[PDB]
Every structure is written in C-alpha cells, then in structure tokens.
Structure 1
Amino acid sequence: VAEMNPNVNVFVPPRDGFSGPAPRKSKLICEATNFTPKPITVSWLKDGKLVESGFTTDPVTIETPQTYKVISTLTISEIDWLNLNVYTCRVDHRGLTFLKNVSSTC
C-alpha cells in the first residue's frame, strides 16, 4: 500500500565496552525501522570487504501503514576497532541501497 525509505542506524560499543579474555570482542547492531514492504536485505561491510561469518540477523518482526523492524548483530574484535577500521551496514530495500559509516574517531 505504500513505499517508504528505510532508516539505517548503527550502534557501537563505548570505550569500556570490551570484556572477556584477551583479545576482547564486542558486537555491532544495525537496525532498520519504519520500512515497507516487509522483505529487506541486511549486509555487513568491513573496510569495503563483505563479512560472510560471525553475524546473526534476527527475523523481521512487526513493530495506518504497516511497519516492520529488523535487528542484525555482527561480532567484532577489539584489535580491529583500535586500527580505526570503518564498519558499514548495507541495507537493500526494493532495489535501493543505503550505507552508513561509523568510526571511533571524534
């Protein structure tokens, strides 16, 4: 019934967000909300390289135009984060690609 551009948001751990035995690891959360129709493709990119392992995408769930939400989690390493690596979340919706870039730099 309607077409809306998805919104891309990326969550990053804080400076004290790493724990566990060395090397410490953390997670990245990319969530797309208020998008239609229900089908959507979520992909993870690391410095231009596609990530094919260490990620889990939650099933799409329902949050008047119908709305949906999707949650994706990618495991990251502390060493890679300290090297100023840039993580990009790739979202495909009705042939449209939206990219979001995050980094530890201020």
Structure 2
Amino acid sequence: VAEMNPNVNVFVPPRDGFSGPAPRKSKLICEATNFTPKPITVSWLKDGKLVESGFTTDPVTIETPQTYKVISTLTISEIDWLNLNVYTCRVDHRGLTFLKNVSSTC
C-alpha cells in the first residue's frame, strides 16, 4: 500500500556502560522503524569488515499504512571501542542501502 524509506538509528553505550570481568563488553542496537513493506535486511559493519558472529537479530514485529519494526543487537568489546573504531549498520530495503556511521569522537 505504500513505500517509505526506512529510518536508521544506532544506539551506543555511554562511558560507564561497560561492566563484567576484563575485558569488558557491551552491545550495539540498530533499529529501523516506520518502514514498508515488512521484509528488511539488517547487517553490521565494523571498519568496513562484515561481522559474521556475535550478533542476534530479533524477529520483525508490528508496531493507515501498515508499520513494522526490527531490532538487532551486536556484541562489542571495550578495547575495540577505545581504538576509535567506527561501527556501521547496513540496512537493505527494496534494493536500497542505507548506512549510518557512529563513533566515540566528540
């Protein structure tokens, strides 16, 4: 019934978001909302390298055009974050690619 470009949002842990035995680890959340149709592909990129492990994508659930949402979680290491590594969330929708870049730099 409609075609809308998905919105890409990336969540990062704060400075005090790391815990557990050394080395500490955290998670990254990439969520796409208000996109149509239902099918969507979510991928994680780390400094241009595809991540093939340590990630879990939640099933697409329903949030007037029909709307859907998708949640993806990627585990990251504190050491990699301190090296100013850039994490990119790859979203594929109807042949269109949307990339979002986040970093610890201010």
- Compute the TM-score of the two structures, normalised by the length of structure 1: 1.00
CA distance in 1, matches of 2:20, 2:2: 46
Counterpart secondary structure, 1:81: helix
Question: Deviation above 6 Å: which 4+ runs of structure 1?
Answer: none
CA distance in 2, matches of 1:103, 1:59: 27
Structure 1 unaligned spans of 5+: none
TM-aligned CA deviation for residue 98 of structure 1: 0.2
TM-aligned CA deviation for residue 82 of structure 1: 0.1
| Correspondences of 1:3-18 after superposition (within 5 Å) | 3-18=3-18
CA distance in 2, matches of 1:9, 1:2: 21
TM-aligned CA deviation for residue 78 of structure 1: 0.1
- Compute the TM-score of the two structures, normalised by the length of structure 2: 1.00
TM-aligned CA deviation for residue 25 of structure 1: 0.1
TM-aligned CA deviation for residue 34 of structure 1: 0.2
TM-aligned CA deviation for residue 65 of structure 1: 0.3
CA distance in 2, matches of 1:99, 1:43: 10
Q: CA RMSD in A?
A: 0.2
